Design an enzyme around this catalytic site. Structure first.
Site: not given
Ligand SMILES: Cc1ccc(-c2cc3c(N[C@@H](Cc4ccccc4)C(=O)NP(=O)(O)O)ncnc3s2)cc1
Ligand SMILES: Cc1ccc(-c2cc3c(N[C@@H](Cc4ccccc4)C(=O)NP(=O)(O)O)ncnc3s2)cc1
Ligand SMILES: Cc1ccc(-c2cc3c(N[C@@H](Cc4ccccc4)C(=O)NP(=O)(O)O)ncnc3s2)cc1
Ligand SMILES: Cc1ccc(-c2cc3c(N[C@@H](Cc4ccccc4)C(=O)NP(=O)(O)O)ncnc3s2)cc1
Lengths: 339, 339
Positions: A46, A87, A92, A96, A101, A163, A188, A227, A231-232
């Site tokens: 993303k 990278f 990773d 694992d 992925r 980890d 990490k 965050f 995720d967990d």
């Molecule tokens: C620095 C940084 C790194 C990864 C992220 C990620 C956000 C994200 C994500 N966030 C959702 C919001 C979200 C909220 C709650 C639970 C899941 C997802 C989002 O982007 N909403 P937007 O309407 O702005 O596009 N959903 C699925 N994968 C990822 S990876 C955000 C900031």
């Protein structure tokens, strides 16, 4: 902010590649391989980390100083973050023994790559610095960026070591403490996922002060902790048709925030139910864990944590955002904290 | 030059480690692992690359400017070269599935390391830059050294990619051309083994000119080609009780200088004997190759090459050593060309 510039960003990749693959015919074969590596592994995420650099650079620089070349450089450094990510992932997944992925076969698992992926990962890392040379060697923040990427690499590597020591995929829970969970996440993932991209924008904007950076880091690392904890949680309770992920933290003996909490709360009896079932792949034995977490009202503990976390972030932002526009930080909190 | 300073050098390692393992108790465990990684893998070579930095720095700087701190820094950067070497080896042995290295179990092959060595290698690489920060951030050549280590990393990685493409340990010889052999050696070993340490001394001594560096490189890369070609010869004809190594280039389907030559010379008939036996581990099938090389008087072709090579180097030195003391270069040629 983000949907609004994801096109220019993902489109710039082509250039990133054209340049990284161009005097020396003898090595062209290897460069061909490099192209392939970059196409498979820098693409399909993303792009939130890379994008954060671009968005933040827009927010931070007086728009009079945002010429075509400046933007180009923000795209480039945004792609440098995505290459760091790439990278680490490739390497990773070897470690694992992951299978997939971003919804495809892991690179190392492709026919005739295998452990050659080790070197492919190392090239991914190298391309960061090539890119910085090519686009930024003349800039005054050149060295600051190198130091930041190198340091971001080191902390992530340390976190990875930490980890690996914590979770030998072999059965143990006494090492899954909250102190240690928190450490793992900071080194990490948080540092490079949250601090690194804003910091890079900051340096790009002339904001190099240790103080400023300490402040931004303080907000960003706490955002990064959240965050990961989310995720967990979603690894197990996320509706998988929202997420895209189907979770395997329990099968993989991970040091998940969930298990950490579960262990803080469990009777000496329930420790047993967990000692017996964590890490096994039997669905029954995976179910009897989820069902324990549920018996311990941990989804409630999460909600409780997310609320406090949401205040703490806003507090941190109120306290340390200055003199950066709070929007830099809110732009990220928005991407994280859904209502 | 070299025997004369190997003590101070190998003794400084302790300090290198003390510093790399020292504010942050939470990660101490990982640091413990790092210590272990450095002790197993930075130690036990002959230290020729690192040493070259120290010796050359002595030769290059006016002795009035060689204070304790300056020396400390030359030891340190010498150890940075040895850490680069260590990083590549650990990762290369995983990739080749090697069993031993420097006469011990390869790190990855130890119980409970395995593919965790991937990250261990990455830390080895990181320590380079930590060390440069700690000892050199205030020096005027700081950035030059970073760029040189990073570039030395990239070319080596490229060379590695190139070799992996060339020799899939699966049977093929048409890709074993001299153009390609030469390319592999330049990128994979010569650059970091010969150019990098002298260059680092040069930068440390204020000699940063592109011209100077181009000149030194020209000598050094040709020295590096020879070194490797000799390595290839001795892999098979080296008395193993001199060497310490017992060779397996033929069993491992390597793109050895020997085979390259063998292929340039062979009748279409003898190509067959080689197509049938190269890469097999049967001693009979390993013998029937050695015996072919011998039938083609390749040990003579080597001697012939070593003579010409020895002239070319001296010529190069006469032509491009200036204004560095020729002794910088001769000090290395001495370590290579026995009579
Ligand atoms: C620095 C940084 C790194 C990864 C992220 C990620 C956000 C994200 C994500 N966030 C959702 C919001 C979200 C909220 C709650 C639970 C899941 C997802 C989002 O982007 N909403 P937007 O309407 O702005 O596009 N959903 C699925 N994968 C990822 S990876 C955000 C900031
Ligand atoms: C369990 C839980 C409790 C409270 C929250 C809160 C989310 C939230 C919030 N979240 C924004 C996201 C956000 C967060 C921070 C700054 C800006 C925007 C949101 O969900 N907006 P949407 O239109 O999609 O409903 N904004 C203002 N106050 C709150 S309080 C989230 C989860
Ligand atoms: C096959 C073959 C043919 C010629 C040589 C030569 C080696 C050599 C040479 N070698 C030095 C090593 C050397 C090389 C270059 C500069 C200085 C010292 C040497 O072997 N000294 P040692 O006391 O151990 O016999 N020095 C001066 N002329 C020559 S000619 C080596 C191998
Ligand atoms: C930059 C650089 C990197 C590796 C080397 C190596 C030299 C070398 C080596 N050279 C022998 C010389 C030698 C000559 C001919 C055949 C084998 C070995 C040597 O060091 N002799 P010295 O009397 O100075 O201690 N022998 C075994 N392993 C290695 S690894 C030298 C320079």
């Amino acid at each position: 902010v983000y949907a609004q510039e994801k096109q220019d960003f993902v489109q710039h990749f082509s250039q990133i590649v054209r340049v990284l693959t161009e005097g020396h015919p003898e090595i062209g074969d290897a460069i061909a391989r490099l192209k392939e590596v970059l196409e498979y592994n820098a693409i399909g995420g993303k792009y939130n980390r890379g994008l954060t650099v671009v968005v933040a650079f827009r927010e931070l620089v007086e728009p009079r100083k945002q010429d075509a070349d400046s933007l180009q450089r923000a795209w480039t450094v945004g792609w440098c973050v995505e290459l760091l990510q790439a990278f680490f992932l490739v390497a990773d997944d070897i470690m694992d023994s992951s299978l997939t992925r971003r919804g495809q076969i892991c690179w190392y698992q492709k026919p005739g790559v295998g452990l050659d992926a080790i070197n492919d990962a190392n090239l991914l890392e190298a391309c960061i610095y090539r890119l910085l040379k090519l686009y930024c060697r003349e800039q005054p923040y050149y060295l600051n960026l190198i130091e930041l990427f190198l340091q971001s690499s080191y902390q992530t590597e340390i976190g990875q070591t930490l980890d690996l020591l914590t979770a030998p995929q072999n059965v143990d829970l006494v090492r899954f403490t909250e102190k240690r969970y928190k450490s793992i996440v900071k080194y990490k993932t948080a540092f490079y996922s949250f601090y690194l991209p804003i910091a890079a924008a900051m340096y790009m904007a002339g904001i190099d002060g240790e103080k400023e950076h300490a402040n931004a880091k303080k907000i960003l690392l706490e955002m990064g902790e959240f965050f990961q904890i989310q995720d967990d949680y979603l690894d197990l309770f996320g509706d998988p048709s929202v997420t895209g992920k189907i979770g395997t933290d329990i099968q993989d003996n991970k040091c998940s925030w969930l298990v950490v909490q579960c262990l803080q709360r469990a009777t000496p009896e329930q420790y047993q139910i967990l000692k017996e079932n964590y890490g096994q792949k039997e669905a029954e034995k995976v179910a009897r864990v989820k069902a324990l977490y549920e018996e311990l009202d941990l989804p409630a503990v999460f909600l409780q944590y997310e609320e406090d976390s949401y205040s703490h972030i806003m507090a941190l932002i109120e306290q340390y955002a200055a003199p950066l526009p709070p929007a830099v930080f809110l732009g990220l909190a928005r991407k994280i904290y859904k209502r």
